[PDB]
Amino acid sequence: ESERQLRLRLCVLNEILGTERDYVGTLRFLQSAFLHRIRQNVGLTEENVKVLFSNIEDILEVHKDFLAALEYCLHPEPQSQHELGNVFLKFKDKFCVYEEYCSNHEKALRLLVELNKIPTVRAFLLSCMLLGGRKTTDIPLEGYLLSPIQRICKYPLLLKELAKRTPGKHPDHPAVQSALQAMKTVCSNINETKRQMEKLEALEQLQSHIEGWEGSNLTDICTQLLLQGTLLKISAGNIQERAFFLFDNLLVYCKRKLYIFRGRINTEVMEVENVEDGTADYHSNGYTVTNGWKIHNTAKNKWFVCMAKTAEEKQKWLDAIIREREQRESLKLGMERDAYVMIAEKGEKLYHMMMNKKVNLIKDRSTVPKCFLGNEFVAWLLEIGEISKTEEGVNLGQALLENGIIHHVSDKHQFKNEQVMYRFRYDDGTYKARSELEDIMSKGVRLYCRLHSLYTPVIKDRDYHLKTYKSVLPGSKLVDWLLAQGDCQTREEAVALGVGLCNNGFMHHVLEKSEFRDESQYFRFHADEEMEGTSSKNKQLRNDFKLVENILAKRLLILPQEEDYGFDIEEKNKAVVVKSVQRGSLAEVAGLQVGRKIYSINEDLVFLRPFSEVESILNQSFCSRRPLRLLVATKAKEIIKIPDQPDTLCFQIRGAAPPYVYAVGRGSEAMAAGLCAGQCILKVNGSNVMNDGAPEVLEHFQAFRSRREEALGLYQWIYHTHEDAQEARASQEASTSPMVTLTVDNVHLEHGVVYEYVSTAGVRCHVLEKIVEPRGCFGLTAKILEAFAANDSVFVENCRRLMALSSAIVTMPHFEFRNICDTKLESIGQRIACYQEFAAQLKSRVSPPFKQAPLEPHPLCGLDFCPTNCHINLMEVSYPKMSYTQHCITTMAAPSWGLSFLLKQEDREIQDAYLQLFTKLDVALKEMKQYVTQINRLLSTITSDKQDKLHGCLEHLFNQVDSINALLKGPVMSRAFEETKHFPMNHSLQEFKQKEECTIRGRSLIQISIQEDPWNLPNSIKTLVDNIQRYVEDGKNQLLLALLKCTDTELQLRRDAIFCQALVAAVCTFSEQLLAALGYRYNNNGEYEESSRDASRKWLEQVAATGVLLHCQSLLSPATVKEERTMLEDIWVTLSELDNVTFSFKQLDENYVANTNVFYHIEGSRQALKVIFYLDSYHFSKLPSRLEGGASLRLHTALFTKVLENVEGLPSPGSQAAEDLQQDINAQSLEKVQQYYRKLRAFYLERSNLPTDASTTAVKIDQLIRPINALDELCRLMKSFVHPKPGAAGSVGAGLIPISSELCYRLGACQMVMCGTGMQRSTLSVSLEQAAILARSHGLLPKCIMQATDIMRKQGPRVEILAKNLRVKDQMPQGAPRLYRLCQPPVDGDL
């Protein structure tokens, strides 16, 4: 190895020289810049210069002499004959100059920290570096003060390295070893170098324990180790047990036999991604991960996966990784920030010192506007005294160019001293504040709403010059109130808000003449002006939000065919109507009828448009193959006339009271007569049948009288639900002119009001609010009931099997426990029979198409699982600045029979723990079965590289086994064994705890197999795994038996009902919101001009990444109404349980079911329930790839609850507890929204980093700051609503509702609204939320916000909930804030 040692010594000699050149370079530029440039112009004092830099000077001379003395030996270049030792030995005494420096260094750092707290001094100190020629963003002065103390400590290491290479024959050898004793003793006598030496000693020590090392030494690229340990490197090829060392810029991994090098990664070219427990992969080499994360070398494009034994070690590793990332990134962003701002502060100062006539350099000179010459600027910098050397000036002028303060006029040149023409980026207007102007709408709406939500209002009637003004706010009281709520820190900021509100037409002074001031002047929102009727007469009170037309409509869905959708349109009586429906078309199958008026085409209100433009909308939808969504005029009762054929029917009927159309044949005379599925038959040839069976209806028809059940006729049948289409298909698989007049009731009708308004863009807009009966509700309630019956069939079947393994009854406590268990199994049996019946009831019911609030209490029935008064409030909007959006807010009565009082919440939390523990233990054994298969696969492919891979796999198997032992050992299983203590089993609690001795023996036998006979390894694995499977099943069995015993079957029946009502409403809400989004119609972000396609795609990808948030305006009066309190105490516990629900999606076509994009299905136990939203090919293909691949979408819930009236009088001790319970609900909901907001923020940070043109990332970041600044405001507000500070309490009113509405709207939640009836309080919140959505997102002119809010609560489609529930007593809120009351009509006349 002679040539190696030869070239290696030359490399040490080069490293000494090369690193000293740049280090003395460092000392030279710092001396030049700091001392001389600080004295030219001035805040730093003479003594402060002395303390900072002067001990550099005394070092610097010794180091220049040392550099010369080294460069003299190493002439003309470093050569193998050279000596240096004597040059150290002579300098050894000269290096004792460090004794003063080190004694002062602590004082110099301690000065620098304080001088960096003073903005001017920090900027002056960075300026020194900038003019010198050093990029400020690359090295800190904070580092430079240490850099001398580092390099004296390096000299011992430098000698040690030269000594590693040089042979004993070389004459420098004895000098170098003497010089090592010297440079060591030098650094050892001084505390500061001793510290730097011991911290380097650790790095060299570790490197000395590592063999095989590649790349640069640890001392030279890292300051400290951060973390050390063994992990499983899962990698391409196969798994590798390894040691991992993390150091401050470098991760290095080694084979563990002291250690042997394998490879290293710079923490810059690293990237990290987390993976969830139970995840497995394709396009990555792994298996069922738990306790892992993924690493990406961005330089080599290499993924690999770490795994740790425990979660605690996963967390220790990801936390150290995150910290190292944040420390490096925070220095870099802190230096870039600090540096940019001083360049700005100087740039602006010097700009406004150049714009005065004392200087005037910025002149016009093709003609070039507002320019200057670089020579003159540098000269002027020397003349004013800002520089000492012209070189500094070209450094500053190039820095102001590269930082964007200036540029060249011709698009050619950098900055030069050279009479070249330049210009400041001020001149073309590159700076502005307009982000404070777009947010003034949102702030305005949020403000108006909070003020009018006050129970003791601050906007009110007040007299001026002894004459009443009606709805006025003193400008100074507005300021006092903006401040008291924390919206603005200063009165000045509140005045700036006030001025911009007045400019954007929110409010005015009581005379035209004044701006907003902090004076006693009176101010009034135009939204009151329009409602109290207080315009001057010559403006006619133009109602710029008005009603257009009330609609009653059936929603159809049509998939495109070979030439069209299956129909034509015509203009008739100045309306668009259905001209002709093609026989046997998918439109006929939807139930489109000839002569019907059409209210919307893909949510565009086509009745408002010219006929030639509507044909173009149909065509554009068809050309883009969109699934068509109509609204068509349909009456609540209808007359249909059927040809009575002699041989066969063409339709099916069933249902008792009322009878209903179960099915109809495609292309039939019945279908062409307009018979359609779900129609509930009232009369036949005049004869009433509304309480008469399907046979009585069928008996009118000649074919039925002839053939009875055989009367069906070999048509392709179409059906009322997918449930009916399934039971028909299954029935098929198990087997392989005279007239009649029907008067029918059309179920599933949407009642709508088209509002018109003029937008803030000055253009006309329409809103289609609809109250919709959720078509799926009865079918979905049956499917959830079926799923609970299926789960309970699996539960009863397991627990009966276990009681059949316990053959003996040895003691009376065994008999008592068995009798309890037998009874509870029979009870769950009775529950299974009930839910199958109730599902058959619900499948056998079609009217009323929503649960009315029950007129009377009664014993339990199938409708008690459907949500009471469940209706979806759609709100479609037509083009602002052609845009379409479709907000969804479901309304229901709060679900009803509370649970939070009935449950010892401990029982629920134990039952969660048991059902999750059982689900986990079952998954962990399911992986363990696949693991033994993957090892047998590897062994077949094999029959030291193979040994490393195999050892990694076998270790990972034992890790999985530990990922079971930690579940079986736990306190949850121990408590289960204490509950099941009467039941006979093969193991006691003491046994399994002691059976870690069985896994220690098994591991030792596997290791013995690896050492003595590698072909006995499968037998050893099988033995270990079979023993563990017996323990896992014995755990599963104990947990189902503990569950059977601790389940209260009566409460569970209730819970299921509340859950079923809630989940149905939730799933219906999300169904509608999902179908809006998958239709390119959801948009929480219409404020920011955003195209609804993009907003929808962003929400879909967001929901895939984050979960669905369901937000409930709980809107119950628990302090006052005992019924509503029981509904609150139920829904709170229930939404906590709905958090465990996972949505998921699958493609499934029909063309055998009318009008249903979605067919739900349900899988999984109560805990971890899964809803499969079966979607059509079109909507499924608009899912994100995460959800298309079958992955689970998690539901998060929040529930915000404020009384819409005041509480009058002092609360009783019970009412105080109701308010406290209300406050707890709001607290838990605030934490859960904040988490969803954090997970959205994190998701947006990742999204902004996605590999794209850097200009688009910068624009995205500037965009995303506005939503986030508004959201952070809404969070501050929510915290002050939910946790009011001492003495601010009561001052906030019901504002929690419009504000938590705004929050969960902004986040993109599915929105739900509830009250004891679902038919009055709910109208007041939905009407406000919709009016606020219009005002904050679609630019409804702010003067109209209350007008829409009251018109909606008077004339909107919601009054139809009262005209469908006339028998239900409800109370319009008398104690409500002016935002929630109806406004009385104006008293002064002139309407």
Author numbering: 42 to 83, 90 to 304, 324 to 431, 436 to 806, 839 to 983, 1015 to 1030, 1063 to 1108, 1212 to 1659
Article sentences:
P-Rex1 and its close homolog P-Rex2 are highly conserved GEFs that activate Rho GTPases (Rac1, Cdc42, RhoG) to coordinate cytoskeletal organization and cell motility. P-Rex1 is a 186 kDa multidomain-containing protein with an N-terminal catalytic DH domain, a PI(3,4,5)P3-binding PH domain, tandem Dishevelled, Egl-10 and Pleckstrin domain (DEP) domains, tandem PDZ domains and a phosphoinositide-4-phosphatase domain (IP4P). P-Rex guanine nucleotide exchange factors are autoinhibited, synergistically activated by Gβγ and PI(3,4,5)P3 binding and dysregulated in cancer. P-Rex family members are autoinhibited under basal conditions and are thought to be synergistically activated at the plasma membrane by receptor tyrosine kinases (RTKs) and G protein-coupled receptors (GPCRs).
Despite ongoing limitations imposed by preferred orientation, we obtained a final P-Rex1 single-particle reconstruction at a nominal resolution estimated by Fourier shell correlation (FSC) to 3.8 Å. However, due to anisotropy effects, we estimate the true resolution to approximately 4.5 Å consistent with map features. Clear secondary structure features are present in the maps, allowing us to accurately dock our closed 3.2 Å DH-PH-DEP1 crystal structure and the 3.2 Å DEP2-PDZ1/2-IP4P15 structure into the reconstruction (T4L was omitted). An AlphaFold21 model of the previously unsolved four-helix bundle (4HB) IP4P region allowed us to build a complete model of autoinhibited P-Rex1. Overall, full-length P-Rex1 is locked in a compact conformation with two distinct domain halves. The autoinhibited DH-PH-DEP1 domains form the N-terminal half that makes extensive contacts against the surface of the C-terminal DEP2-PDZ1/2-IP4P half. The interacting surfaces are conserved between species, with the PH domain buried in a cleft composed of the IP4P domain core and the prominent 4HB region. The DEP1–DEP2 linker seems to act as a flexible point to separate the N- and C-terminal P-Rex1 halves. Intriguingly, the P-Rex1 PI(3,4,5)P3 and Gβγ membrane-binding prenylation sites are off-axis by around 90° in the autoinhibited structure. As such, we hypothesize that the cooperative binding of Gβγ and PI(3,4,5)P3 to P-Rex1 at the plasma membrane results in the counter-rotation of the N- and C-terminal P-Rex1 halves to align the membrane-binding regions along a single plane.
